Paper text:
To address these problems, we engineered a highly responsive circularly permuted GFP (cpGFP)-based cAMP sensor named G-Flamp1 (green fluorescent cAMP indicator 1) by inserting cpGFP into the CNBD of the bacterial MlotiK1 channel (mlCNBD), followed by extensive screening. Here, we report the development of the new circularly permuted GFP (cpGFP)-based cAMP indicator G-Flamp1, which exhibits a large fluorescence increase (a maximum ΔF/F0 of 1100% in HEK293T cells), decent brightness, appropriate affinity (a Kd of 2.17 μM) and fast response kinetics (an association and dissociation half-time of 0.20 and 0.087 s, respectively). The concentration-response curves showed that Kd values of G-Flamp1 for cAMP and cGMP were 2.17 and 30.09 μM, respectively, leading to a 13-fold higher selectivity for cAMP over cGMP, which is similar to other widely used cAMP probes. The apparent association (kon) and dissociation (koff) rate constants were 3.48 μM−1s−1 and 7.9 s−1, resulting in a ton of 0.20 s under 1 μM cAMP and toff of 0.087 s, respectively.
To understand the molecular mechanism of large fluorescence change in the G-Flamp1 indicator, we determined the X-ray crystal structure of cAMP-bound G-Flamp1 without RSET tag at pH 8.0 to a 2.2 Å resolution. Overall, all residues in G-Flamp1 showed good electron density except for N-terminal nine residues (MGFYQEVRR), C-terminal six residues (GAAASA) and a flexible linker (GGTGGS) within cpGFP. Two G-Flamp1 molecules were arranged as a dimer in one asymmetric unit of G-Flamp1 crystal and were structurally similar with an r.m.s.d. of Cα atoms of 0.149 Å. However, this homodimer was not biologically relevant and is likely caused by crystallographic packing because its dimerization interface is mediated by β-barrel ends of cpGFP rather than the previously described β-barrel wall. Consistent with this, gel filtration analysis showed that G-Flamp1 at a high concentration of 0.7 mM was a monomer. Although random coil and short α-helical turns are observed in single-FP sensors with crystal structures available, the first linker along with its flanking sequences in cAMP-bound G-Flamp1 folds as a long β-strand. In G-Flamp1, linker 1 and linker 2 are in close proximity with chromophore and cAMP, respectively, suggesting the former primarily contributes to fluorescence change. A close examination of linker 1 revealed that the Trp75 stabilizes the phenolic group of the chromophore in two ways. First, the backbone CO or NH groups of the tripeptide Trp75-Gly76-Asn77 indirectly interact with the phenolic oxygen of the chromophore, via a water molecule, to form a hydrogen-bonding network. Second, the bulky side chain of Trp75 protects the chromophore from solvent quenching.
Residue numbers in the entry: 10 to 159, 162 to 163, 165, 175 to 237, 241 to 383
Write the structure that this text describes.
Amino acid sequence: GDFVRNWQLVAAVPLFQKLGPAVLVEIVRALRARTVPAGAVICRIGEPGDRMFFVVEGSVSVATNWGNVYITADKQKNGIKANFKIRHNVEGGGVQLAYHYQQNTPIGDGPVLLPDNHYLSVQSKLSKDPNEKRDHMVLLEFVTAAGITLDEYSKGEELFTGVVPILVELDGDVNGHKFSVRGEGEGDATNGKLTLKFICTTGKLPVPWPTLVTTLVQCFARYPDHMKQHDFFKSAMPEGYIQERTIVFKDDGTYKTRAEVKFEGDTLVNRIELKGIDFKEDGNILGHKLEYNRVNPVELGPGAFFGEMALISGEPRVATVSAATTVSLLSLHSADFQMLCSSSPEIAEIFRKTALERR
Ligand SMILES: Nc1ncnc2c1ncn2[C@@H]1O[C@@H]2COP(=O)(O)O[C@H]2[C@H]1O
């Protein structure tokens, strides 16, 4: 019943052809098949991991950790403040730190939610559209609020109950290099999910796309039920908020940004002015020495696997994995994973090395 199905499906996984038929029958009896709708989260970062997954149809996207955004109320200015560090990989190895200093002030006169101290967890995947000739960035992002212990007996939030279209506009000036970016896409606050594509409309971007991610809509963060009273960003909608930043690149220049974030009709719009000063023309930013996505460069399609890191290390999921298309999965529980690795040292090696490479 399920076995004839999983037996048919397991043919799409060439890793298992490293296996005799009697044993393969036993493995297929332990596999569980799953159809996953396009866009759905399969594994969430920080969750415990009791199984791993083999892709039989479709592809999945891995979104890796970008860090935490630490937020505090600014009750006297009726807004919030945030500070955090971004670690950009340098292409030859090493890291370029970007220290972020942030303040947000509502545009409207009405009261907003002024939160207790908390943070936003961000995971991201950066990619390219193989049919796009312009300089561009395709971006997938998950944003989750956390840091308030869950005791256990805003009107702006109802603007984000579904999928909201987003428009992003940036005029930049870095060491006199002027440039513009336009981006469009959609925000799903219910799942904390951003999917956008950005174009440099003036030609070649004079800085690396990863350094513009933070500047290019925290109102799409998923605030958990017990934290809805701490979501300043949605509470200031629809009139919106001003968001300003100082971004200090260690041993290099600084970005200063001012943005208007607000609804125009049904569309959440983010309009940005950015000025960069004191950059080194042969440094990591103006010299384009930062990795775009070498860490995590591809969706994982048929024959690939994920979820193996937690089973090897015992640590929680290190990344969020979501279906890019409709996905057909076979999952394998932890205990049967250890037996698979024991029965086939070849397969054990493939897992070991892949998990190392991904670490
Ligand atoms: N840089 C990466 N490239 C590809 N896949 C990854 C990367 N980082 C994590 N993963 C996968 O994402 C999974 C998330 O859950 P696990 O940590 O159990 O195991 C992880 C790997 O399978």
